[PDB]
Amino acid sequence: AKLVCYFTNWAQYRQGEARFLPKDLDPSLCTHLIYAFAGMTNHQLSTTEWNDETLYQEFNGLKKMNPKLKTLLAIGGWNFGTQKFTDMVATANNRQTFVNSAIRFLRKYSFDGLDLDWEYPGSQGSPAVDKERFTTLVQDLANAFQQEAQTSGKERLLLSAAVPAGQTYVDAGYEVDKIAQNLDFVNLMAYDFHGSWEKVTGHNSPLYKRQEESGAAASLNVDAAVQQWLQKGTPASKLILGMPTYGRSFTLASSSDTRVGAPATGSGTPGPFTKEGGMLAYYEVCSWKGATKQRIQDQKVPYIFRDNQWVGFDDVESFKTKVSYLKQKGLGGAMVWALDLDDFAGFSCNQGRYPLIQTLRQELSLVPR
Numbered sequence: 130a131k132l133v134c135y136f137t138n139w140a141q142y143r144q145g146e147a148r149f150l151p152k153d154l155d156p157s158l159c160t161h162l163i164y165a166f167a168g169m170t171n172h173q174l175s176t177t178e179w180n181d182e183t184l185y186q187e188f189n190g191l192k193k194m195n196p197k198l199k200t201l202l203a204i205g206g207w208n209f210g211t212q213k214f215t216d217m218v219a220t221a222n223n224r225q226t227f228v229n230s231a232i233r234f235l236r237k238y239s240f241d242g243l244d245l246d247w248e249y250p251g252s253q254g255s256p257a258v259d260k261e262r263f264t265t266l267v268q269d270l271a272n273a274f275q276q277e278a279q280t281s282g283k284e285r286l287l288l289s290a291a292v293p294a295g296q297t298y299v300d301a302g303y304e305v306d307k308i309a310q311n312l313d314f315v316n317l318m319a320y321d322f323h324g325s326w327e328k329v330t331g332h333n334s335p336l337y338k339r340q341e342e343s344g345a346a347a348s349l350n351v352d353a354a355v356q357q358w359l360q361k362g363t364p365a366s367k368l369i370l371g372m373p374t375y376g377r378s379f380t381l382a383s384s385s386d387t388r389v390g391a392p393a394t395g396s397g398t399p400g401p402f403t404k405e406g407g408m409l410a411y412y413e414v415c416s417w418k419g420a421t422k423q424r425i426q427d428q429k430v431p432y433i434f435r436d437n438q439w440v441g442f443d444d445v446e447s448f449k450t451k452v453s454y455l456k457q458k459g460l461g462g463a464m465v466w467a468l469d470l471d472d473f474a475g476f477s478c479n480q481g482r483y484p485l486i487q488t489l490r491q492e493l494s495l496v497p498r
Contacts, residue, residue, distance in 0.1 A: 130461070131160045131369055131462030131463070131464075132158075132161070132463055132465070132493055133159065133160070133161040133162075133163060133289075133314070133316060133369050133462065133463070134159035134161070134163065134464070134465050135162075135163050135466050135467040136162060136164050136467070136468050137165045137166075137467050137468070138177065138178045138184060140467070141180075143402050143403070143469075146474055147402035147469075149469035149473060151184065154187065155483065156191035156192070156194040157195050157198075158468075158483060158486055158487070159465075159486070159490075160199065160462070161199045161200070162188065162199075162201075163200070163202070164184075164185070164200065164201070164202045164203060165203045165206055165467070166203050166204060166205060166206040166209065167203065168209060169213045169214075169217060171226075172213075172216070172223045172230070173227065173230035174230045174235075175234075185238045189238065199287065200240050200241050200242075201241060201289060202238070202240045202242075203243075203244035203245075204231075204243065204244070204245060204246060204247075205245065205247045206248065207248045209246075209248070210254065211250075211253050211254045211259075212254065214247045214250070214255065215254075215256065218263065224269050228270055228273045231270065232273060232286065236283075240286075241286065242286045242313070243288055243289075244289045244316065245266075245288070245289070246290070247263065248293075249293055249301070249302045250301070250302035251263075251298075251302035252297070255302070259302065260301065260302050260303070260304065263302060263304075263308070264304045264307050264308055267290070267308045268307075268311050270288050271311035272311075287313045287314075288311065288312055289312055289313055289315065289316055289369075290316065291316040291318055291371075292316065292317055292318060292358070294317060294319050294322065294349075294351075296348060296357065299357065299358075299361070305361035305363060306361060306363075309362055309363040309364060312367065314367050314368075315358065315367050316369050316464045317354060317369060317371050317464070319351045319354050319371040319372070320334040320371055320372070320466065321377070322350060323349065323377065323441070324377035324407055325380075325395060325397065327393070328394075330381070330388070330390060330393050330432075331441065332377075332389065332425060332428055333373055333376050333441045333443075334373050334430060334447075335349075335350045335351065335428030335429070335430050335441075336352055336429040336430060336450060336451060336454060337351075338427065339425065339427040339428060340427055341390065351370070352454070355370065355454075365458060365460055365461065366459070366460075368460050369462050370454075370455045370460050370463050370464065371464040372443065372448060372451060372466075372489060373466055374410070374411045374443070374465060374467060374470040374485045374486065375403075375409060375442065375470040376408065376409050376440045376442025376443070377397075377407060377409075377440070377442075378406075378438060378440040379395070379396065379407075379439045379440075380395050380396065380437055380438065380439075381438070381439050382437075384436050384437045387423075387434045387439060389428075389441075391439070393439070397409070397439065397440060398438055400413040403470075410470040411443070411444075411478070411484075411485055412472040412477035412478060413477075414440050414442050415444075415477060415480070415484075416478055417433055420434060420435035421434055425441075429447060430442075430450075431443075431444050431446075445485065448485055448489055449488060451463070452488075452489060452492035453492070465485075465486055471483050471485045471486050472484055
């Protein structure tokens with residue numbers, strides 16, 4: 130089993146207890162640690178924060194304490210957009226520039242692989258031609274990593290990708306059966322299914338549909354997303370089930386209707402640490418004073434409300450349920466977005482350090498002996 134965990138290079142800017150610093154990294158918590166994010170400059174892999182090189186040293190330095198640990202560098206992310214990917218994959222020349230830069234960069238900074246997080250080929254401004262060009266990019270990287278291993282005698286660089294759960298994005302961008310052959314593993318982003326972009330409440334990461342749902346909505350759940358990727362050709366052993374250590378929040382139209390599917394007027398109030406309306410870290414909801422926690426019986430996940438605020442999130446029990454699910458489906462492990470959104474310092478939830486991610490590690494039978 131794998132436990133793949135994302136580090137984010139902006140968590141260092143949060144205030145107080147929520148500030149995530151190198152000391153908060155645990156070398157033995159996860160099997161694979163992925164650094165979010167690198168960017169691109171003139172079609173070449175590049176840093177995005179002023180101190181990334183410092184953090185790379187610490188991050189990859191964890192391997193001295195746990196030599197089994199593998200690290201990867203993720204390129205892209207939502208905020209990165211699509212244009213630089215589009216421009217880079219447009220020509221064989223530009224792809225080669227990128228691929229060669231990536232090998233050099235990963236070797237220089239002591240990463241074990243690259244995670245592709247283009248959001249997304251064929252959508253978010255990216256043209257339809259990018260579906261096949263993404264397939265080509267994945268193959269170009271896989272083949273170049275293979276060649277570099279042969280020539281250098283070094284253990285081959287890993288290639289993974291973070292991929293969407295919804296059919297619209299999947300079919301616009303992803304030749305699943307082709308790319309899965311060339312990726313070492315596939316990080317399924319089985320979250321962000323619902324959120325404050327919708328005008329009714331819905332859960333960030335429900336396991337199954339609700340009885341009331343129909344049409345496309347009936348596939349906006351973890352089980353449907355997993356089955357989608359499997360049926361379209363991903364080997365189960367390569368599919369890694371993403372898990373969110375955050376929730377998505379709404380302002381309710383009325384404090385009297387707190388159901389799933391109740392009318393919402395917009396994003397929930399920003400959290401005191403994460404300061405982004407519409408999401409909250411686990412540590413911002415786990416100890417929510419004067420709130421009422423409930424459960425979506427069909428979907429196997431909790432929500433919580435207080436006055437006109439409503440949040441769908443994941444707890445220890447829902448993580449257990451999801452690990453049982455992934456094991457039943459024979460998947461390759463779990464992935465988690467993100468280290469810094471769990472109660473990494475144990476300051477809020479009275480559950481110790483990393484209560485959610487330790488649940489994953491336990492349930493996957495990955496606790497160090």
